[PDB]
Design an enzyme around this catalytic site. Structure first.
Site, PDB file in Angstrom:
ATOM      1  N   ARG A   1    -108.705 -91.998  51.367  1.00  0.00           N
ATOM      2  CA  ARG A   1    -107.352 -91.581  51.718  1.00  0.00           C
ATOM      3  C   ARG A   1    -107.303 -90.931  53.093  1.00  0.00           C
ATOM      4  O   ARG A   1    -106.285 -91.029  53.788  1.00  0.00           O
ATOM      5  CB  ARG A   1    -106.806 -90.626  50.658  1.00  0.00           C
ATOM      6  CG  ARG A   1    -107.604 -89.345  50.498  1.00  0.00           C
ATOM      7  CD  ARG A   1    -106.884 -88.360  49.597  1.00  0.00           C
ATOM      8  NE  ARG A   1    -107.112 -88.640  48.185  1.00  0.00           N
ATOM      9  CZ  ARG A   1    -108.086 -88.102  47.465  1.00  0.00           C
ATOM     10  NH1 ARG A   1    -108.953 -87.258  47.998  1.00  0.00           N
ATOM     11  NH2 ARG A   1    -108.193 -88.419  46.178  1.00  0.00           N
TER      12      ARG A   1
ATOM     13  N   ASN B   1    -105.361 -84.040  45.726  1.00  0.00           N
ATOM     14  CA  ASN B   1    -106.093 -82.799  45.504  1.00  0.00           C
ATOM     15  C   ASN B   1    -107.422 -83.128  44.836  1.00  0.00           C
ATOM     16  O   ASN B   1    -107.467 -83.434  43.640  1.00  0.00           O
ATOM     17  CB  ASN B   1    -105.266 -81.845  44.648  1.00  0.00           C
ATOM     18  CG  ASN B   1    -105.796 -80.424  44.675  1.00  0.00           C
ATOM     19  OD1 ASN B   1    -106.940 -80.181  45.056  1.00  0.00           O
ATOM     20  ND2 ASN B   1    -104.964 -79.477  44.265  1.00  0.00           N
ATOM     21  N   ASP B   2    -108.508 -83.066  45.607  1.00  0.00           N
ATOM     22  CA  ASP B   2    -109.820 -83.468  45.114  1.00  0.00           C
ATOM     23  C   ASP B   2    -110.417 -82.483  44.121  1.00  0.00           C
ATOM     24  O   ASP B   2    -111.419 -82.815  43.479  1.00  0.00           O
ATOM     25  CB  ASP B   2    -110.783 -83.654  46.286  1.00  0.00           C
ATOM     26  CG  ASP B   2    -111.035 -85.110  46.606  1.00  0.00           C
ATOM     27  OD1 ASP B   2    -110.104 -85.926  46.445  1.00  0.00           O
ATOM     28  OD2 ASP B   2    -112.165 -85.438  47.020  1.00  0.00           O
ATOM     29  N   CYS B   3    -109.844 -81.290  43.979  1.00  0.00           N
ATOM     30  CA  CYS B   3    -110.381 -80.278  43.082  1.00  0.00           C
ATOM     31  C   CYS B   3    -109.584 -80.144  41.792  1.00  0.00           C
ATOM     32  O   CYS B   3    -109.858 -79.239  40.999  1.00  0.00           O
ATOM     33  CB  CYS B   3    -110.455 -78.929  43.798  1.00  0.00           C
ATOM     34  SG  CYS B   3    -111.687 -78.872  45.119  1.00  0.00           S
TER      35      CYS B   3
END
Lengths: 810, 810
Positions: free
Chosen positions: B360, B482-484
């Site tokens: 992304r 949001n990767d977390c």
């Protein structure tokens, strides 16, 4: 030129100058907590894992070297200095470092104030204790400030030092009383923390590296120590640290003592918190309270002292040579014990990032420490055989933490299976118990497909005979004991491992080193098959050995020495027809040990060629001449510059096999001369050239083809200690463990009048005195045990817990 | 408090004190050679890879900070100092650092001698040029000695700094004339080397780190510089370095010129040696000769100057605000261009060890630089779709070097496929070139299974509808933008990554952020389905969008703001029923951007809640309240301490979406106030609080829940630059690319009298003047193009290479 002296009474090496050619390190810890420490109080600590549980941050290859450690600062009216001369590096009136067995003492004096610090990891304790003594030797009233300092690691060495995008915002500390707690990611899946404490009221503290040191200041002059006051900072991310500050008044002739502890605590996940956001500290309090007085530290220091005394009392030597006595009695056996606790994890040359040790290294090292820890040697052997595959192969890398092999590295190192039988025989010879062969051992860590340990030895034996080469020699796999001789790799691009990359079929290239291994080790397999009552298999096994022996004679002898191997093109490797690498050192060591050319004079010819071609004043090089270019057909061996590592470097690991081979032909003069060239005690006077620790062995010494000939590398962690001890204790001194009892067969220099060796063996102590009336090297004329003459050279096994006087006349 | 000033005429930031709150770095290089440099001449350089082709050694998280770089020493009668005040750190009479576009200048004066050095990587050159100027401003005859110093890396960052057991014996150098060549492992498999040269005759040199510096000395006081002459050492293993020494005589008012090059040379395997053991240096000779005069360096400096001038000439703004003008015209577009050349490889927070950037991130960053490099944006888009899988998924991590995904990282990040269509529409809207949709694009990098790029957009569009949750919302998968936020992980083991560890089935948890993405991005898909004549497909696609939009109203609204997601237990995430994380920032940004709830007042309610709850003086926090403990159901988000990173930190990436959302409702006062809070130029006066570079964006600023509120982390490499430029240039200033032309729709603060924007668009330059006679935020009453009134708010496309005066009345 030397930088210290041996203190044999205290079993210490005393370092008298701080500016040593290289940081000389020691090892503390025995079971789970381990720490590295140099003469300037550098190094770090970890719990069971230098990769996944590192406690203290340390920077390898730093400028200046060895910056980072248990640093103490003494502030006195605008002047500050450190007892270890580092990192402040202000000239001291006096200095001393003493590396002991499991402890280190450093003393420093400047401007009338003397500081002495003792570092050691106590037994059954998850922490390092630092007992500090401050003394006023002047003639006036003085007021000083003492600063302590350690730097924390974020529990994952690789992550602490590659992943700053995340871990710069995860650092967390707690300050309560005189203790600073490191709790990075404790609000998370982690259930362990570390603490730094003192047993006294502090006047200040610091937990942020920037506050105590300064962004543009080094360890030499921290901004807080320079100003003489602590900033009382609390760390919020970035780099957590721990630091205490104490105001001390010292009247003339008055001294004060302090105790510092770097502890490690693990908690159950259901009791991780005393309160919301507050770390449970119930066991940290108990750890601190256990060593809150110096008498407690003194008692634990003597407890560790007796631990190392017992570990060296199984082999005691009394001879005329002071350098030989200290190596055999103290330092050779100390490095062997350390290398078992440390494996190949952490050193000043191993960064602690690797995942495990080699499969053969665990087996090869077992010979050295089998007499020291017989019980823990059997456990290691069974865990090694559990790793073994069903077809008779074993994983190249062993992981002692997980007690299993490494699937990523794989298999197909055909020398590895033989090391299991050699180690098993050494365990059985030392202990005399055969119950190991009947235990059920899983295959590939699969309990369902389990069989006997003797069956595991059978598959290792038949893996060699089921993979014979065109000449009947064992097929080489990815490599042999020499990890840089890859005869079917053919790598053309960098970043590609020579060991695990195979481009050829591997059905042509064979090795002669395994052939000498097969005959030498297989000789001990026939004895095992005789013990189990399997006469037919023993008869067939000896037949395969005899066929290999004639194959070695037919296709393994060059005419003056032994062949090394055959590459993928069916060419002789290690032969006079080559341009470089005409003669190696691995085939001469084991084929003579296998007694292949004793009667024909072939063994003598090979050893005379080793002296003629491979001999240097500092040791024996791997091969001669060195490879001056890159050979794709051989692998990693030609990648090094000449004289370094495998490119004709002095590998002291295989120098012992030459030492043992000289015993077989009966030349004790040559065997001891070879031993003296690489023994640490005999090269201590050339410490400026050796450049490494003059009390432990190093893996590699630069050879004659290098510009730094005599310089060592990769010290403190190698199989050199185990094999060189076996060479001197068993093959030269003649005290050989064997089936049915202790065997006596010395091969000593002729000029020796005699020696005395005290040996612990199968529950009894043999006090063996060897006399040399007629100055001969080999040959026993009479053996007397307890005043009665005996037949042969095998001492009876008593197992009664007493001492027997053994008199030997050559 | 400030540490410098903006030099808008020279497009530089001038640093006046060497002790900034942190090392402020710049970037050099455009195509293959890249270099990092700070205000004290720190940093390192590499060739195309900070992991596998690193040239200069650099230590992250060092004590002192930023030790290691292109260091120069000036020796003058026993006194030595460095122009950058580091590493010597002796007080200078004057000092200056100037960070430009692709270059850095550092000047320093002490004891009458002034030294100025210019660093830059020339275009189409595999090297970094260091032009040094020395001047005698005193009043007497002087004799000085100049020392240069760099430290070499062993070509493999991870191996150079974890594998000392091997690489300590592989270091090799070659000194010929004034050039020092580094050739570690050149003999075996590497066909590349590096050199350090000067264009004048030297009096001494050094290649061994210990000889020039000393084992117990740091960079501040090398033993050779302290003594005043070089040791002429040749490195053999250990740490190779490069150093020159020149004796200089300077009469009063006289100056001397010197040029230094750090080059990188690659060779063909056939032409790798000039002679046996001698490196072929013919390419290094040509590289040195190309910049052996100062006039040559002057010409290359101007060539690089025009390169960056043209890259920023597509969007020019003339307004009353000086801080706004410098951000839009110079520094926002400069960071966008750098972030495309640098990806996410090397910074002072990225160690250069990772293998690639997020899928992304390449798509998201494409919006920022599509107007600057239209041709190189289409190539990136096709390479991104080439790694796409056949079902409509893409690999999470993209590797621009290998132009392929990362199989180890995997897939199942369901937000990733939508970013491809958004980037494709942005490319099409900017360029007007529709030929991209007809090119053949392989699936999973397999040419056999290839189809049209429009088909790739179809699968990514249909990867959302084919994976819907119980409410009809898109399935979150492993995570979203949001990767977390990992709702399928449920990790309890410290050593496993939250991103790739999945323990749940993933058939329940949905995300509302992708739903707002689906409607907003799917609007561009219906337009594409109309361009290809697929009327039936457009009708079906719009039906799925309308169904998703009504699902957002039915299940994605909380009453005052929008829901964030649904976890594995079917519970609302980002709702007032929760104890913490009552409201997020990502659902409000995209759902309002999708024109959802405009007529019902729902969009206005969400934005009023963002101001009420998530607003801070330094930005907008991710969510409120912060998570004060660990939530296993959410993933990595709760692992951080409050106020840091995703735990209610200020992520300026998603602050732009709030800025864009305020435009939709028509509040230009709020939109520009949000923009000013995080713009580097407006926070330069609080540089002591920001602590990072005041001329570029940072990934994260500490939030209101932290003790360091306002402090930045992870600067110079983020998607923040791209989105914040789009927010101000397109949504606030109103210059929006559209399918049929250039759209004008500003949303500015009411008090603004007007502004002028010059825009390059599809081969023509639009000089748009916006005036605000009646002070309103949004609404266009008249648009005049070339003196003639037009209908609507879409400017005609001319494509004639001329300038058109566009008059806009609000």
């Amino acid at each position: 030129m030397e930088f210290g002296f041996f203190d044999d009474a205290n079993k210490e090496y005393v370092i008298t100058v701080p500016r040593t050619p290289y940081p000389w390190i020691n090892y503390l810890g025995t079971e789970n907590f381990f720490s590295l420490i140099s003469n300037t109080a550098g190094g770090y600590c970890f719990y069971r894992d230098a990769r996944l549980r590192r406690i203290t941050r340390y920077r390898y290859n730093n400028v200046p070297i060895d910056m980072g450690g248990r640093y103490f600062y003494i502030y006195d009216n605008g002047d500050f200095w450190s007892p270890g001369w580092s990192p402040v590096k202000r000239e001291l009136e006096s200095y001393e470092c003493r590396h002991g067995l499991g402890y280190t003492k450093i003393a420093g004096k400047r401007n009338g104030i003397k500081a002495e610090v003792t570092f050691f990891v106590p037994l059954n304790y998850n922490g390092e204790v630092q007992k500090l003594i401050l003394k006023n030797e002047g003639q006036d009233k003085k007021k000083i400030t003492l600063f302590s300092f350690i730097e924390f690691c974020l529990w994952n060495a690789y992550d602490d030092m590659t992943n700053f995008q995340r871990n710069f915002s995860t650092g967390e500390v707690e300050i309560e009383g005189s203790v600073i707690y490191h709790k990075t990611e404790y609000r998370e899946r982690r259930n362990h923390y570390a603490f730094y404490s003192v047993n006294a009221k502090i006047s200040g503290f610091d937990s942020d590296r920037d506050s105590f040191i300064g962004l543009y200041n080094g360890f030499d002059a921290p901004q807080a120590v320079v100003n003489g006051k602590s900033n009382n900072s609390v760390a919020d991310g970035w780099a957590p640290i721990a630091s205490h500050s104490i105001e001390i008044e010292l009247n003339p002739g008055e001294q004060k003592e302090y105790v510092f502890i770097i502890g490690y605590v693990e908690n159950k996940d259901e009791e991780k918190w005393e309160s919301k956001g507050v770390i449970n500290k119930k066991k940290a309090y108990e750890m601190i309270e256990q060593f809150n007085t110096v008498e407690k530290v003194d008692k634990a220091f003597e407890e560790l002292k007796s631990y190392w005394n017992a570990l060296l009392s199984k082999y005691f030597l009394e001879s005329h040579d002071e350098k030989l006595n200290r190596m055999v009695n103290i330092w050779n056996q100390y490095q062997c014990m350390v290398t078992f606790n440390m494996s190949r994890s952490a050193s000043y040359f191993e960064s602690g990032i690797g995942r495990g040790m080699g499969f053969r290294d665990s087996n090869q090292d077992l010979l050295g420490f089998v007499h020291q820890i017989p019980e823990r040697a059997r456990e290691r052997l069974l865990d090694l055989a559990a790793t073994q595959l069903e077809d008779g192969s074993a994983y190249h890398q062993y992981q002692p933490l997980t007690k299993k092999g490494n699937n990523e590295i794989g298999s197909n190192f055909n020398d590895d299976p033989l090391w299991l039988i050699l180690a098993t025989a050494a365990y059985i010879k030392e202990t005399g118990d055969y119950s190991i062969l009947k235990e059920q051992v899983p295959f590939n860590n699969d309990p369902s497909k389990a069989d006997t340990m003797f069956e595991h030895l059978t598959r290792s034996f038949y893996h060699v005979v089921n993979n014979l080469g065109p000449h009947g020699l064992p097929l080489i796999g990815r490599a042999d004991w020499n990890d840089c001789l890859n005869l079917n790799c053919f790598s053309t691009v960098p970043d590609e491992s020579f060991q695990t990359t195979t481009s050829k079929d591997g059905k042509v290239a064979e090795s002669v080193m395994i052939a000498g291994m097969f005959v030498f080790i297989g000789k001990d397999y026939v004895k095992l098959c005789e013990y189990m009552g399997l006469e037919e298999e023993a008869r067939k096994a000896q037949q395969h050995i005899d066929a290999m022996k004639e194959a070695i004679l037919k296709y393994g002898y060059d005419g003056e020495w032994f062949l090394r191997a055959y590459d993928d093109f069916g060419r002789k490797v290690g032969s006079k027809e080559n341009e470089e690498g005409k003669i190696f050192i691995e085939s001469q060591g084991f084929c003579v040990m296998a007694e292949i050319g004793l009667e024909d004079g072939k063994a003598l010819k090979a050893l005379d060629s080793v002296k003629k071609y491979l001999d240097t004043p500092y040791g024996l090089v791997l091969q001669n001449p060195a490879f001056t270019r890159y050979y794709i057909e051989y692998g990693e061996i030609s990648t090094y510059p000449p004289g370094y590592k495998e490119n004709a470097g002095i590998f002291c690991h295989n120098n012992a096999w030459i030492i043992c081979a000289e015993t077989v032909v009966g030349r004790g003069d040559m065997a001891f001369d070879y031993y003296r060239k690489i023994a640490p005690a005999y090269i201590e006077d050339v410490s400026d050239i050796h450049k490494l620790e003059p009390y432990v062995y190093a893996q590699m010494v630069a050879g004659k083809d290098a510009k730094r000939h005599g310089e060592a590398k990769n010290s403190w962690l190698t199989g050199t200690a185990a094999w060189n001890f076996v060479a001197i204790s068993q093959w030269i001194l003649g005290v050989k463990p064997d089936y049915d009892g202790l065997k006596i067969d010395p091969c000593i220099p002729k000029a020796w009048d005699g020696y005395k060796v005290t040996r612990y063996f199968r529950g009894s102590t043999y006090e063996i005195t060897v006399k040399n009336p007629n100055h001969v090297s080999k040959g026993v004329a009479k053996i007397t045990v307890d005043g009665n003459e005996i037949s042969g050279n095998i001492l009876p096994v008593f197992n009664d817990g007493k001492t027997h006087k053994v008199e030997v006349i050559l």
